[PDB]
Amino acid sequence: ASIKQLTLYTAELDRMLAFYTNMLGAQHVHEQADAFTIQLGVSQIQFRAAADGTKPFYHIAINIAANHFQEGKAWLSGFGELLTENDEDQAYFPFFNAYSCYVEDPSGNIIELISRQQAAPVLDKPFSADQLLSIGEINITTSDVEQAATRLKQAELPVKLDQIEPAGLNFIGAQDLFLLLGPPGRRWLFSERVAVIYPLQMELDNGVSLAITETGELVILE
Ligand SMILES: [Mn+2]
């Protein structure tokens, strides 16, 4: 499956709108009162105003073509200093056979471009914002990992309950989309920030809709 719509919160609505408009172009953004949406290929993200006293952020990876990694990395570096880990400004993940690069947006969201070497198409054309393919990862940071995994299995997602680690990160998915299911607490790779529970809502290709409440419970909406 793929993510049709992801709803996230932000305490920096105005700066976020300016950042994404400059990055993707007005044609890929739609401003509303107290919220705006951005189009990322077949996926859309709607950023809504956060509650005062909160500064939500998330880890979002965006799929790009198998052959577009260096162009993607160059393009991303135009919007912010590339984040680094172990002093390197990119990573290779053998589990996903993918190359990744990162930048922070105005809210501190960890924005990753992930180029899956065998699980993404080869696009014989120049890379551009119009070549972002879909959302490839989103963190599902929950107060109950076991309960959450059990419910995602119903949402029809591939889940091997016997391998679910309640105190760690769990890669739930296949092909080009993986939900990063885990508890709050640990520092995210490439970031100074640690995983913390913030609300979000997600609508999948299969008509399944879910939400993470402000206390971290994963709930199937439809
Ligand atoms: Mn990632």
Side-chain angles (χ1 to χ4, degrees):
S2 80
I3 294 171
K4 295 185 161 182
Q5 199 185 63
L6 176 61
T7 298
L8 304 177
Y9 293 89
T10 175
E12 295 295 338
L13 195 63
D14 293 331
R15 290 173 62 221
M16 291 279 280
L17 175 66
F19 177 81
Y20 284 105
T21 295
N22 178 60
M23 172 184 274
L24 310 166
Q27 47 122 176
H28 292 310
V29 184
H30 181 79
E31 171 182 8
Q32 304 160 64
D34 318 307
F36 68 93
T37 64
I38 64 180
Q39 189 70 30
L40 302 173
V42 296
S43 296
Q44 170 185 281
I45 298 186
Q46 177 182 78
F47 281 109
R48 298 182 67 70
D52 288 345
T54 72
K55 301 285 184 50
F57 75 98
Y58 311 79
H59 175 35
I60 305 69
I62 304 170
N63 282 312
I64 60 173
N67 61 310
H68 281 170
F69 188 69
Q70 286 300 319
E71 283 174 78
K73 178 180 181 191
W75 174 79
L76 200 73
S77 74
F79 305 109
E81 190 161 9
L82 292 177
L83 292 177
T84 71
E85 180 80 32
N86 295 149
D87 306 294
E88 304 188 19
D89 65 357
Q90 64 176 58
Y92 171 74
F93 295 112
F95 183 70
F96 298 117
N97 187 15
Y99 287 96
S100 300
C101 57
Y102 308 72
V103 74
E104 292 183 312
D105 69 8
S107 297
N109 291 311
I110 304 164
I111 306 300
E112 171 187 348
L113 294 191
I114 183 167
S115 178
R116 304 175 190 277
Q117 296 311 103
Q118 211 138 44
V122 169
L123 300 185
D124 187 3
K125 67 200 292 74
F127 175 79
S128 83
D130 299 280
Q131 303 309 306
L132 296 171
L133 309 171
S134 57
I135 291 164
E137 305 182 337
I138 179 63
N139 60 295
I140 297 297
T141 306
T142 183
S143 50
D144 199 326
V145 174
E146 305 182 59
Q147 174 189 65
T150 303
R151 295 182 177 171
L152 284 165
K153 194 168 185 179
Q154 287 180 294
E156 298 295 292
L157 307 179
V159 178
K160 278 173 188 162
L161 288 178
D162 293 294
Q163 282 157 50
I164 290 293
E165 298 291 340
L169 199 56
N170 297 269
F171 298 140
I172 289 64
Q175 301 135 284
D176 64 6
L177 171 67
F178 292 81
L179 266 31
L180 316 179
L181 178 68
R186 197 161 77 187
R187 183 181 73 80
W188 285 108
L189 206 70
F190 283 82
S191 179
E192 294 194 23
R193 303 173 110 96
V194 300
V196 162
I197 296 167
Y198 286 117
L200 61 69
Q201 291 83 63
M202 183 179 326
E203 176 184 356
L204 306 176
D205 242 31
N206 58 182
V208 178
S209 276
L210 59 156
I212 283 285
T213 68
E214 78 288 345
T215 65
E217 188 186 347
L218 178 166
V219 309
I220 291 290
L221 302 177
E222 179 189 354

